[PDB]
Amino acid sequence: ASVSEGVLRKKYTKFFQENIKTHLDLKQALLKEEKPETALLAYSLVSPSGYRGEPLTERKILEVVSLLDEVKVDGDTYQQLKNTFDSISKDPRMQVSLENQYPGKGVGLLVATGRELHKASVNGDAEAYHHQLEQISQLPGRDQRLSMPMQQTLAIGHAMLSAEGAVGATLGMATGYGLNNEVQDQLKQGPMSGVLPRLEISNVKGDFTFSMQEPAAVRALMAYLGPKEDTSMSSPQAPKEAQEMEAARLTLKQMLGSSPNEHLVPDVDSLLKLSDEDMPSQTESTANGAFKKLLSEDWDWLMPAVRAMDKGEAGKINEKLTYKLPLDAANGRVYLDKSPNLSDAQLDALDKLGSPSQLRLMYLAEGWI
């Protein structure tokens, strides 16, 4: 109802037939019709980074992200995303989020193997947590333009880190490469992520440009959309620079599904505790322990529990999820059942959350709650 991609490289193959290797003199070749003002909008994805600081300026995936930037039918939903990005790119608060995920821009064989079997299992769980999360935003009431490609990027990024865990554990066990490029070529097959705008950054440290199909720029965008608004920056008392970067911030936080009351501060650190005043308020702390139970009790229970909660029917969770599996016993097949044993205390806490925001479920899939 909100997203429909394709993989037809033969419908518009004239843009990829000749050896076009120049960012300049490509807008005339990208017109190709009697439409001019809307063919420049698909060129706006690569145009601020089309000259400054890039190698060879036309990599073979930079055209398919610009060809399949389908603005031909609809020119409203992508323009709203383009009016919001580069309006979000003004405060240092987005920029300090784009510096935490980055740098500056014998018995010892049993230990080093276990450090990389832990890496292959954490990233194998977290990749599965985004596959059952791209079918929660398939349910009615959600949206798919911002929710789908944001978490399709992360599921590709966890599939590569999980592959590097046990390829490294194999080459260390069989000793005490070309396999990482074979799996990198394999995960680009099949579908591909929807096009989001470019998120250029210009400041006193230079003029930077990130990609938003990188798993580290996605991971810093959702950390920006976390915290609630304050008493400042949205009142008309301060018309200075705030209302064009705060209403652009809240129109993405609502676009996931998070109301401006919802706080959602991250957790990962090297410290013991986080703080005192930004703590979850024991109604969602009881509820976050119920969602973690649904992630780690079955591979298929998070989607029909959110579906049962959008209808306001979050008290029938113990009965709508029960199903029966067989068991060979000493008396025969018995057909016992598996139910999520949600207690009444955390079944009540799922009621006071009206619907889980998509931003809350994506912090949960990254281990930030």
Partner 1 sequence: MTELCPVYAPFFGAIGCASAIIFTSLGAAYGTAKSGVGICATCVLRPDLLFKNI
How far apart are the C-alpha atoms of 240 and 152, rounded to whole Å?
A: 37
User: C-beta of 326: minimal distance to partner 1 in Å?
Assistant: 15
Q: Please report which residue ranges of 174-203 form alpha helices under DSSP H.
A: 178-186
Bridge partner residues of 324 (DSSP):
337
With the CA atoms of 119, 121, 126 and 130 taken in that order, what torsion angle do they form, in degrees rounded to the nearest 10? 130
- Please answer whether residues 266 and 223 qualify as being in contact, where contact means their C-beta atoms are separated by less than 8 angstroms: yes
User: C-beta of 347: minimal distance to partner 1 in Å?
Assistant: 31
Residues 6+ apart with CB under 8 A from 358: 136, 137, 142, 147, 256, 257, 258
User: C-beta of 325: minimal distance to partner 1 in Å?
Assistant: 18
User: C-beta of 331: minimal distance to partner 1 in Å?
Assistant: 5
Q: Which is nearer to partner 1, 56 or 330 (CB)?
A: 330
**Which spans of this chain sit near partner 1 (rule: CB under 8 A)?**
329-331
- For residue 336, report the phi and psi dihedrals to the nearest 5 degrees: -80, 165
Task: Please spell the DSSP secondary structure of 290-335, one letter per residue.
Answer: HHHHHHTS-SSSSHHHHHHHHTT-TTSHHHHS-EEE--B-SSSB--
Q: Which is nearer to partner 1, 112 or 327 (CB)?
A: 327
User: C-beta of 334: minimal distance to partner 1 in Å?
Assistant: 8
Q: Which is nearer to partner 1, 174 or 329 (CB)?
A: 329
Which two three-digit tokens encode residue 92?
A: 């240092």
Q: Please report which residue ranges of 14-97 form alpha helices under DSSP H.
A: 27-31, 39-43, 64-67, 77-84, 92-97
Q: Which is nearer to partner 1, 111 or 329 (CB)?
A: 329
User: C-beta of 322: minimal distance to partner 1 in Å?
Assistant: 21
Single-letter code of the amino acid located at 239 = P
How far apart are the C-alpha atoms of 291 and 362, rounded to whole Å?
A: 12
Q: Which is nearer to partner 1, 231 or 331 (CB)?
A: 331
- For residue 46, report the phi and psi dihedrals to the nearest 5 degrees: -115, 0
Q: Which is nearer to partner 1, 177 or 335 (CB)?
A: 335
Q: Is 203 helix (H, G, I), strand (E, B) or coil?
A: strand
User: C-beta of 330: minimal distance to partner 1 in Å?
Assistant: 4
